[PDB]
C-alpha cells in the first residue's frame, strides 16, 4: 500500500502477547519432552530384554519333551512373561503415539511463531535502517568516550540476546524447510533446536533469562554503581550534529524501539523454547510489560523533555540552479496539514511534500496521506550566472498551530518564502480554517547574497526533510550561511506530543515512516515485485519478467523481440496536466504511451543505449482528454 | 550464621540429590509381576527332577530375568529414596531457610526504600559528571 | 559449580572491588559514597 | 568442507565417548573367576537331588552372584568397546583431521608473518591516536 | 556445550563484530583496515 | 609450596605498597578515559 505504518512499542508488545496466547493454545500434555524420551528409552531397554528372555524360553520350551506337568508350568510361566512383555510394549506404543502426535503440533506452532515474528519484525526494518544511518554518520573518532560508556555494560546482554534470537530464527527456518521438503526423523531434525531450547531455558546462573533481566537493568540503571544506558546513548546521539533524517526525538525513539523490540523477540524466543521442550507454561507477559513500561517511562521522563524537535535536511548536493521566475506552493486542502518533505536528485531534482489529515493529538492519518511533486527544485534555490538574494526568517508559529501552506517565490533572484499555519485544537483533531496565522518574508529588506561563480554551485539540501515518522510541523525556515554556500531546510515537528499521548502512556499508536516510494504515481505495480501482475500484460512469451535482471534483485521486465509489456493507465491520466515519466533501464529499450483506438505515440523514446542500468526522467503532457492510454515497454 | 548452623543440621547422610524418573507407577507393577514370575521359575527349578541341560538353560534364563528385575528394583529403590527420605528433608530445610531469610530481610526494607529514593533522586537531576562517579568493574558481579 | 565463572568467584570479585583490591585501587564503596554525598540529592538522613 | 565430509565419514554408530576406567587388568580376572564359580554353582543346582529350601536359597545366592558378575561384565564390555571399536577410529579421524588442518594452515603462513610484521611496526611507532583505532568488543571472542 | 557462553556463540559474536552488527555498527574490519592503512607502517605490499 | 610462595611474595610487598600509593595519588577524576582503556581487557583475567 506504499505506506509502512508503525504501530509503536505498545503495538509490538500487543503482537508479542498475541503470539504468547497462540503458543499457550497448543496443549503438549503433562510430560516434558525429555521425560518422554527417558521413559521411551527405559521402556525400550526393558522390552528388548524381556523379548530376549521370552524368545529363549520359547525356544527351550518347544524343543524337549518337557513331560506333562513341567510343560504346563513352563507354558504358564511363558504366558505370564508374555503378558508382562505385552504390557511393556503397550506402554511403549502409547509413548510412541504420544510423541507422534506431539511433534507435528510443535512443528506447526514453531512455523506459526516464525511467521508472526517475521510479520512483527517487518515493522522495525525502517527503524533498524535509521539506526544504521545514525551509526554511520556518527562522529565516533571523538565520541569514543561516550560510545564506550553506553556499550560497555549492555554489550554482553545485547550479544547474547541477538545470538539467541538469530539462532532460533535460523533453526526454525531450517526445520520448516525440512518439514516442507516419522517421529524419529522429526527428532533428528529438531535435535539442534531442542538443544538451543535447553540452553536458553536452563534455569541456572548466567542463563538467557539472566541476560534478559540485566539488559533491562542496564537500560534503566537500577544499580547505583552503573549508569542508565538509555540516557547515555541519548546523550551520545543528540550531542554534536548527526545529519540524518528526523530530529533528536526521532533518533532516540528509534534506538529505544530497536532495544524494546529486541527484548520482546527475546521473550518470545524464551516462551517458544519453553513450549518446545514441554516445560511448564509461565506467562512472561507481566514481566515483559514491566520492562517495556519502565524503559518507556525513563525515556519519557528523563530523556524526551530535554530533546529537540528540530530536524534539517540529511545532506547537500552542489548544484547550479537557474534564473527568472520560479514559484512553488506546498498548499494543503482544508483539513490537511504538511507532515514532511523530500528532495530527490537522481535524474531531475524533485520536491515531494506530504500532506495528510490529522486524527487528534497530532496523529497523521495514513488513509488520507497524499503527496505533491514539484519539478526542477534546483532552479528555485540556486542561481545560474548571477547573484541570488535570500530573504530568510524562522517562520515559527505558536504551539497548537499546524503549517498548511508553504510558498516559495524566486523573482529576479529574490527568494522570498511565506508560510501559513491553521489552528489545530488537538483535543479533537479538527484543523480550523478560520483561525490562521501567516509568517511571511515578502516584505523583508535585509537579505543574504550568494554569487554562483560558475562551477562554485550552491549546496542545495537533499534527502528527507522530515521527522523519523511523519508529523505536523509548526516552524519552517531556510538557513543560508553565505560562506560555504549551503542551504538548509530546518523544521520543527510535533512528534513529542503524539508520543506523550499515544505510545508513552500505552495507547494505540499509528506512526508513518516517510515513504521512499512515490505514492502518487499512477502506474500500478511500478516496481515488479508483486506476483500475478494484473496491470502488466505480455502480448506473447517473447518478453517476460527477470527475477534478477533488474535493480539489485528487482524482477525487471525483460523484452527480447516483438514482445512488449502493456499497462492500461488511461483512467488515472488527468487531461491538461503535466507528468513526470521516470524509469531505470538497461540496454536499448523503447517506451510509448499508446491510446488504444487509433494507436498514436504521445510519448516515445525509440533510442537510448546503455550496457548498465541508468535512470531516465522526462516530462509529458496529456491534452485532448485521453481516458484511454496504456504504457508500452 | 544461625541459618548456616540450621542448614548444617540437616543429615542428608551419604545421600546425593538425583533425578526422579517419575516412573514409579509403571515400575512398581513391572517389579511385582517380574518378582512373581521369577519366584515361580525359581520354585520350578528347585523342585528338581529335571534334565541337566534343561535345568541349566532354565537357570540361565532365570539369572537373566533376575538381572532385569534387579535393575528395575534398583531404579525403584532410587526413586523411593529420593521421594521418601531425601525430598521431605530438603523441603523442610528450604522452608526453614526461606522463613529465616524473610525474617532477616524484613530488617533491610527501610534501607532498600532509602536506596531506591536516592537512585530516583540521582537520575532525575544529573549530567555527564555522574559518569565520572560510576563503576563498571563491579556491574557483572553485582548483577550476577 | 567450580570454574572460572563460579558464583563464589563473583562473590570474591564483588568484595575485592568494594574494598578496592583492583589494579589501581578503584574502590566501589568510596566512589558510591562520593556519588551519594552530592548536595543535589535531597533525601532524609545525613550523608553518614 | 572437505575435512567436514571426512569427519562425517567416521561411523561412530550409536556409540558415545565414555570414561575408560583403566581397570581392565583386574576386572578380567575377577570376571573369569566369578564366571567359573557361577558355572560350578549352576551345575550343582542343576544336578538336582537337593532339598527344596536349600535349592531355593542356593538359587537366590546364585542370582545375586550372577548380578555381581553381570555388573563386572558390563563394565568390562564398556571398557573393551571404548578401547577396541571406538578409540582407534577416533584416533584415525584425529590424525587425518590434523594432517589436513596442517596442510591448509601451510597456506596461511606468509600472511601470518605479514600480520606479525605489521603488528611489530604498529607498536614501535604510535601514540594515543591508536587508541581511537582499537576495538574492545571483539577481544574476548577473538581470544577465546 | 550449549549455553550463553558457548563456543558457537563466540563464533557468531566474532562474525557480527567483524561485519558490524553491533549497537552502533562499529565494524571491526573497517577499524582494523583504517588502522593498517596508516602511512607510519612501512612494510611490503599495498594497503589492499 | 606455601612457605616458599610466602617467602617470594615478601619481596613484592613494597612494590604493592608503591602501586597502592600511586593509585591513591592518581588523578582519576579526569583520567577515566585512560584508566578505562587499560583495565577493560586485562580486568577479567586479572580478577580470575
Numbering used by the authors:
A (entry chain A): 14 to 194, 202 to 653
B (entry chain B), D (entry chain D): 30 to 173
C (entry chain B), E (entry chain D): 222 to 269
F (entry chain C): 126 to 173
How does the study describe this entry?
Here we identified Vip3Cb1 and Vip3Cc1, the first Vip3 proteins with broad lepidopteran activity discovered outside of Bt from Paenibacillus strains in the P. popilliae-containing clade, most closely linked to P. dendritiformis. Vip3 proteins, including Vip3Cb1 and Vip3Cc1, are highly conserved in Domains (D) I and II involved in pore formation, with divergence in DIII, IV, and V known to be involved in receptor binding to the gut of the insect host. Vip3Cb1 protoxin and trypsin-processed Vip3Cb1 toxin structures were determined using Cryo-EM, resulting in density maps with an estimated resolution of 2.6 Å and 3.0 Å, respectively. Therefore, structural comparisons of Vip3Cb1 to other Vip3 proteins, including commercial Vip3Aa, are consistent with other results, such as amino acid homology, that all Vip3 proteins share the same mechanism of action, even though these originated from a Paenibacillus strain and not from Bt.
Each dimer pair (monomers A/B, or monomers C/D) is conformationally distinct, with equivalency between monomers A and C and monomers B and D. Domains I (DI) (residues 1–192) and II (residues 202–329) are α-helical, whereas DIII (residues 330–533), DIV (residues 534–675), and DV (residues 676–797) are composed of β-sheets, with homology to carbohydrate binding motifs connected by extended loops. DI of each monomer is composed of two twisted α-helices (α2 and N-terminal α3) connected by a five amino acid loop, allowing α2 to fold back to interact with α3. In the tetramer, DI folds into what could resemble the nose of a spaceship, with the monomers arranged in an A-B-D-C configuration. DII forms the spaceship main body (α1, C-terminal α3, α4-α9), containing a central helix (α8) surrounded by other helices, preceded by the tryptic site (Lysine195) for protoxin activation; however, this site had poor density for modeling (residues 195–202). DIII (β1-β14) forms the spaceship base, ending with a helix (α11) that interacts with DII. From DIII, a linker extends, interacting with N-terminal residues, before starting the extended fins of the spaceship, DIV (β15-β24) and DV (β15-β34). Comparisons of available Vip3 structures, determined by either X-ray protein crystallography, Vip3B2160 (45) or Cryo-EM Vip3Aa16 (43) and Vip3Bc1 (44), revealed that the Vip3Cb1 protoxin has an overall similar quaternary “spaceship” structure with α-helical DI-DIII forming the body and β-sheet DIV-V forming the fins. Activation of the Bt Vip3A protoxin occurs by cleavage between domains DI and DII. The Vip3Cb1 N-terminus has the signature Vip3A signal peptide “ALPSF” motif.
